[PDB]
Design a protein around this ligand. Structure first.
Ligand SMILES: Nc1nc2c(ncn2[C@@H]2O[C@H](COP(=O)(O)OP(=O)(O)OP(=O)(O)O)[C@@H](O)[C@H]2O)c(=O)[nH]1
Ligand SMILES: [Mg+2]
Length: 267
């Protein structure tokens, strides 16, 4: 039986609690009760035919609770990221939510092994709609997130979002908690293809990472990591990316070896 952790993020009054209670407790009330810091609960779901025990940390969206929320970003498998189509400041704030999560995970952190369901919520409201499906779908899908139009009041989109959410999370768990490689684009970036070819026909390790002689260890480190995320054969399906990755790895150590050796014979 699978044990996972789900959190909710997004501005106050956006509907995080009511999305969760609509699907898990089959209930909805119009009366607002702001989450105070964080609400913890356990629910059980059966998706695929894996039995999933879901630890939910429903977070409070008000900024006053910044310090309360920071403890609960680590070891997260799924995120319910919510805004209100009727209030565009909640959609714009979503970059800040990603930033806040990304720092509580440190530089190790790869939100790419986390499933995100973006919920454009309250589509049922008569009120003037200020965020359109194009804009939210583009912001979400361009980041590898799922996107759904939802209403906790009507139920629209709720069951479909949660079914897609938990299936992506089951797929993530069956792959060791690493983002599953999707057949829907075993293609590859153009800059990926350029970097692989530029790395074949390169005979110098300075130019292989894009740095000139006399570079800090910290600069060759930071050149290396941007190529590593670009070219790792797990992430990049282009032919020859494994050899390009190996070449980048070996170049980094060639430079790091001579840097520290020139620091030891000089100063
Ligand atoms: N019309 C409409 N109202 C909604 C919908 N979802 C939530 N609400 C209302 O919006 C208010 C806020 O909903 P919550 O779920 O408590 O919002 P929240 O994101 O949990 O807010 P905080 O916990 O304070 O961050 C409540 O009054 C809900 O009734 C919706 O889909 N449609
Ligand atoms: Mg809440």
């Amino acid at each position: 039986a699978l044990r996972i952790k789900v959190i909710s993020m997004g501005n106050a009054e956006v509907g995080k609690s009511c999305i969760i209670k609509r699907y898990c407790e089959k209930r909805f009330v119009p009366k607002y009760q702001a989450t105070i810091g964080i609400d913890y609960g356990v629910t059980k779901v059966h998706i695929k035919d894996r039995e999933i025990k879901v630890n939910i940390f429903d977070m409070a969206g008000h900024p006053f609770f910044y310090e309360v929320r920071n403890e609960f970003y680590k070891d997260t498998q799924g995120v319910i990221l919510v805004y209100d189509v009727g209030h565009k400041e909640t959609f714009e704030s979503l970059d800040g939510w990603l930033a806040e999560m990304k720092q509580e995970l440190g530089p190790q952190g790869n939100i790419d092994n986390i499933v995100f369901a973006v919920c454009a919520n309250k589509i049922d409201s008569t009120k003037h709609r200020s965020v359109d499906e194009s804009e939210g779908r583009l912001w979400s899908e361009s980041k590898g997130f799922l996107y759904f139009e939802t209403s906790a009041q009507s139920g629209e989109g709720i069951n479909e979002m949660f079914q897609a959410f938990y299936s992506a999370i089951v797929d993530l768990c069956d792959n060791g908690g690493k983002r599953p490689v999707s057949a829907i684009n075993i293609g590859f970036t153009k800059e990926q293809a350029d970097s692989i070819r530029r790395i074949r026909n390169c005979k110098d390790s300075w130019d292989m990472l894009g740095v000139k002689p006399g570079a800090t260890r910290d600069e060759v480190n930071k050149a290396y990591r941007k190529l590593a995320v670009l070219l790792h054969p797990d992430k990049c399906m282009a032919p020859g990316s494994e050899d390009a990755f190996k070449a980048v790895v070996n170049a980094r150590t060639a430079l790091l070896k001579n840097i520290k050796l020139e620091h030891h014979h000089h100063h």
